[PDB]
Amino acid sequence: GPLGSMKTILVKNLPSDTTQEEVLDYFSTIGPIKSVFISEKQANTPHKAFVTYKNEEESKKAQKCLNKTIFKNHTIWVGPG
Numbered sequence: 001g002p003l004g005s006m007k008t009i010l011v012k013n014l015p016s017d018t019t020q021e022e023v024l025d026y027f028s029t030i031g032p033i034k035s036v037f038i039s040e041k042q043a044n045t046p047h048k049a050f051v052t053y054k055n056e057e058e059s060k061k062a063q064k065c066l067n068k069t070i071f072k073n074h075t076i077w078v079g080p081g
Contacts, residue, residue: 007034007059008052008081011066014038015074016047027051030065031058050081 014023020036027033032054039048053059067078 001056005081007054007056008050009059009062010079010081011049011051012077012079013046013074014049014071014076016041018049018071023049023051026071027053027062027066030062031055 011023011027018038020038023036023038024033027036030053033051034054035052037050037052039050041047051059051062053062063078063080066076068075069078070076
């Protein structure tokens with residue numbers, strides 16, 4: 001699609017001690033990633049991170065392939081930014 005922001009997806013529920021490199025490694029299974037942002041923790045809210053893919057085709061596939069997968073010992077949710 002035409003909007004570059006779409007290449008950035010939201011990852012919910014990563015463990016609090018997860019590193020940016022670990023996110024890179026896990027999400028790079030789908031395709032190349034430009035950047036990883038682990039957001040500051042919001043009060044009373046699950047952890048959130050944003051992964052920006054090089055290609056929208058791969059960000060879409062990541063949502064399908066990685067939603068409700070098990071990252072170490074946490075289930076994670078993956079969807080649109």
